[PDB]
Amino acid sequence: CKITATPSQFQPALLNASKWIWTGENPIPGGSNIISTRPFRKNITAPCGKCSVCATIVVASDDAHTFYVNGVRIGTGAGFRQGQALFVALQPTWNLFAIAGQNLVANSPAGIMASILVHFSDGTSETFVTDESWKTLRAAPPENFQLPSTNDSNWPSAAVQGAYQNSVWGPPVLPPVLPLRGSNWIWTSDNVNGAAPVGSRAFRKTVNQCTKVAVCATVLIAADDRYTLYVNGATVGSGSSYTVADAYTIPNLHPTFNTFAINATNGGGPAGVIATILITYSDGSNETVVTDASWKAIQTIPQGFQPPLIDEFGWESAKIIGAFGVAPWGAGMVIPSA
Numbered sequence: 001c002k003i004t005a006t007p008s009q010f011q012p013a014l015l016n017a018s019k020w021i022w023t024g025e026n027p028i029p030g031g032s033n034i035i036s037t038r039p040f041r042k043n044i045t046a047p048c049g050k051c052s053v054c055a056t057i058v059v060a061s062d063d064a065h066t067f068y069v070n071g072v073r074i075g076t077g078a079g080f081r082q083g084q085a086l087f088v089a090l091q092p093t094w095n096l097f098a099i100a101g102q103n104l105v106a107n108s109p110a111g112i113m114a115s116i117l118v119h120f121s122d123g124t125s126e127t128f129v130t131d132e133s134w135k136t137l138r139a140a141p142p143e144n145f146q147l148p149s150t151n152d153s154n155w156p157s158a159a160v161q162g163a164y165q166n167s168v169w170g171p172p173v174l175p176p177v178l179p180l181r182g183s184n185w186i187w188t189s190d191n192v193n194g195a196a197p198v199g200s201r202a203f204r205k206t207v208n209q210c211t212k213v214a215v216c217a218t219v220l221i222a223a224d225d226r227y228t229l230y231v232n233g234a235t236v237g238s239g240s241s242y243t244v245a246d247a248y249t250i251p252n253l254h255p256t257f258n259t260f261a262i263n264a265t266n267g268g269g270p271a272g273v274i275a276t277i278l279i280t281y282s283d284g285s286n287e288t289v290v291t292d293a294s295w296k297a298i299q300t301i302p303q304g305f306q307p308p309l310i311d312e313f314g315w316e317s318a319k320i321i322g323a324f325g326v327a328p329w330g331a332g333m334v335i336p337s338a
């Protein structure tokens with residue numbers, strides 16, 4: 001229950017050990033199936049002596065899926081060529097994962113594949129996957145099939161349709177951990193006419209939903225020249241590339257108030273910092289924060305620019321240099337896989 005895990009480099013959930021599953025209505029795996037919707041459930045328990053905190057999920061489907069965690073709809077998606085990234089807070093000892101899969105083309109294959117990378121309170125992680133231990137039904141999902149109160153003890157086992165490397169679908173591409181589409185390159189307002197002075201600049205963003213309980217954050221960040229990233233005053237990481245982005249996991253968020261602070265440095269010419277942050281809440285919801293004009297910025301970095309509760313007098317609104325994609329940096333940022 002005590003969280004000794006600390007901020008770390010983001011660890012990708014992989015699909016390599018995962019299996020495609022369906023109902024087995026057609027006993028040929030990868031065989032033709034009817035248009036239909038089918039349920040899939042798995043109760044996963046935390047190993048002895050650890051608490052589960054949150055999970056990075058990658059899910060792929062032929063043809064479409066709706067993903068639930070402990071009764072809460074977490075995401076909807078479709079397609080088997082590229083997986084979908086989802087993030088969710090978890091109960092400490094067990095968690096019910098439920099998926100409604102849909103086959104949308106008659107006489108065509110059908111399948112659900114997911115990988116669930118659970119992070120534990122002690123800083124360790126374990127991947128769980130769709131396989132034959134999941135429960136299903138040869139029928140449309142009952143009402144409230146995804147709720148933990150539904151009893152699945154008399155459900156049949158899911159039928160494996162294929163493996164990551166051996167299936168009709170081939171191996172799905174991992175999505176990026178988080179999008180940079182939707183974020184902006186920002187800087188202090190001394191950034192004009194495509195260049196900014198040499199020097200360091202600081203940026204701050206606070207999230208404070210005092211009626212919710214925040215659990216984990218995933219951060220994706222890049223800066224033209226370099227950055228150091230802080231959360232609630234603690235150093236998270238640093239980078240020096242505007243073509244290869246860095247991803248971090250913050251597993252020990254404060255429950256209600258969290259401040260992200262950045263020291264970014266321009267070595268000459270253009271400058272900018274860009275980031276996308278996803279925070280998970282204990283009720284299963286999430287929120288995304290992006291670098292934009294709601295961040296604060298300052299041109300001379302004061303002592304203790306990174307502590308959570310400083311006086312922000314004399315900080316300006318950060319300037320939007322451009323949405324992700326603009327010249328000179330373009331759209332080709334290398335982003336870690338989800």
Ligand SMILES: *[C@@H]1O[C@H](CO)[C@@H](O[C@@H]2O[C@H](CO)[C@@H](O)[C@H](O)[C@H]2NC(C)=O)[C@H](O)[C@H]1NC(C)=O
Pocket residue numbers: 073074075076077085086087088284285286287
């Ligand atoms: C965060 O939670 C929300 C809902 O709880 C999810 O976003 C909405 O639901 C669908 C499901 O993927 C999104 O595609 C839409 O963009 C959202 N609805 C809108 C805009 O009306 C989202 O899946 C969750 N993110 C996670 C779990 O990473």
Ligand SMILES: *[C@@H]1O[C@H](CO)[C@@H](O[C@@H]2O[C@H](CO)[C@@H](O)[C@H](O)[C@H]2NC(C)=O)[C@H](O)[C@H]1NC(C)=O
Pocket residue numbers: 043044045093094095096147148149
């Ligand atoms: C998932 O599994 C856990 C553990 O097997 C279930 O939790 C147990 O439920 C029984 C019956 O209510 C309790 O007596 C135990 O104390 C619980 N054990 C633990 C470790 O919590 C849980 O009910 C299952 N969830 C679902 C949705 O089936």
Ligand SMILES: *[C@@H]1O[C@H](CO)[C@@H](O[C@@H]2O[C@H](CO)[C@@H](O)[C@H](O)[C@H]2NC(C)=O)[C@H](O)[C@H]1NC(C)=O
Pocket residue numbers: 200226228263264265301302
């Ligand atoms: C902000 O970042 C810059 C660069 O990362 C820091 O400036 C460096 O300070 C180190 C001390 O560790 C010195 O060795 C160098 O003079 C600087 N290096 C570079 C590359 O500029 C700066 O101290 C950071 N913090 C603040 C508050 O400005």
Ligand SMILES: C[C@@H]1O[C@@H](O)[C@H](O)[C@H](O)[C@H]1O
Pocket residue numbers: 062063104105108109110
């Ligand atoms: C793999 C196959 O591809 C197309 O025919 C359709 O997407 C169909 O639903 C799917 O099963």
Ligand SMILES: C[C@@H]1O[C@@H](O)[C@H](O)[C@H](O)[C@H]1O
Pocket residue numbers: 224225267268269270271328
């Ligand atoms: C886009 C531009 O490219 C070079 O001039 C340098 O790497 C500089 O730091 C960067 O801003």
Ligand SMILES: [Ca+2]
Pocket residue numbers: 062063103104105108109110
């Ligand atoms: Ca299909």
Ligand SMILES: [Ca+2]
Pocket residue numbers: 224225266267268269270271
């Ligand atoms: Ca530069």
